[PDB]
Amino acid sequence: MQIFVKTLTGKTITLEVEPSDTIENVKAKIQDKEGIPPDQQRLIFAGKQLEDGRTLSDYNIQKESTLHLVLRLRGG
Amino acid sequence: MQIFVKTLTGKTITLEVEPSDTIENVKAKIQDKEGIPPDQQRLIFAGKQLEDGRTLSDYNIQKESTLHLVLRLRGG
Amino acid sequence: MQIFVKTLTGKTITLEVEPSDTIENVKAKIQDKEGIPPDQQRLIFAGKQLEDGRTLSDYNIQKESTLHLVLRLRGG
Q: Which sequence positions carry the modification called ADP-ribosylglycine (chains A, B, C)?
C-alpha cells in the first residue's frame, strides 16, 4: 500500500508499506529515501506519535493515509 | 512523551521523557541538552518543587505538561 | 524547602533546608553562604530566638517562612 508522509519542509514522501510493517521499518524506509537517520525521526498519525515497536496495523493505518514526520536533532 | 521546561532566560526546553523517569533522570536530560549540572537544577511542576527520587508519574505529569526550571548557584 | 533569612544589612538569604535540620545546621548553612561564623549568629523566628539544639520542626517552621538573623560580635 502507499502512505504519504508530510515533512516539515513541505515535501511529501510517498512510501510503499504493508500494515505488517513496524514503525521502525517505516523509519528505515525514510532513511533510504531521504537520508534521515531513524533516531531523528518522529512519526505522527492522527495526532499520535507512533511507537517503533508497533505496526501500522496496530494504529489502523490504511492505504493512502497521511502521516507527519517531525525531526528531533540530537542535543536538541 | 514530550514535556516543556521553561527556563528563567525565557527559553523552553522540549524533552522526551517517560512517566517512569525519575526527576533525577529528567535533570540528566537537561544536563545533556543545556549543559546545566543537575546539582544546580530545581524543577517545578504545578507550583511544587520536584523530588529527585520520585517519578513523573508520582506527580501525575502527563504528556505535553509544562514545568519550570530555576537554577540555584552553589554558594548562593 | 526554602526559607528566607533577613539580615541586618537588608539582604535576604534564601536557604534550602529540611524541617529535620537543627538550628546549628542552619547556622552552618549561613556560614557557607555568607561567611559568618555560627558563634556570631542569632536566629529569630516569629519573635523567638532559636536554640541550636532544636530543629526547625520543633518551632513549626514551614516552607517559605521568614527568619531574621542578628549578629552578636564577640566582646560585644
A: 76
Of B27, B32, B30, B14, residue with least CA distance to B54: B27
Taking the domains of chain B in order of start, what are their residue ranges? Answer: 1-76
Chain B partners of A76 at a C-beta cutoff of 8 Å?
14, 33
Answer whether C32 sits within 8 Å of B75, measured CB to CB: yes
Q: Which chain A residues touch B16 with a CB distance below 8 Å?
A: 72
CA distance A10 to A67: 13
AA identity, residue B31: Q
Report the C-alpha gap between B34 and B3 in whole angstroms. 15
The b/e string for B36-58 (b: 16+ C-beta within 10 A; e otherwise) is: bebebbebebeeeebeeeebbee
Residue of chain C whose Cα is closest to the Cα of B49: C1
Are C16 and B76 in contact (CB < 8 Å)? Answer: no
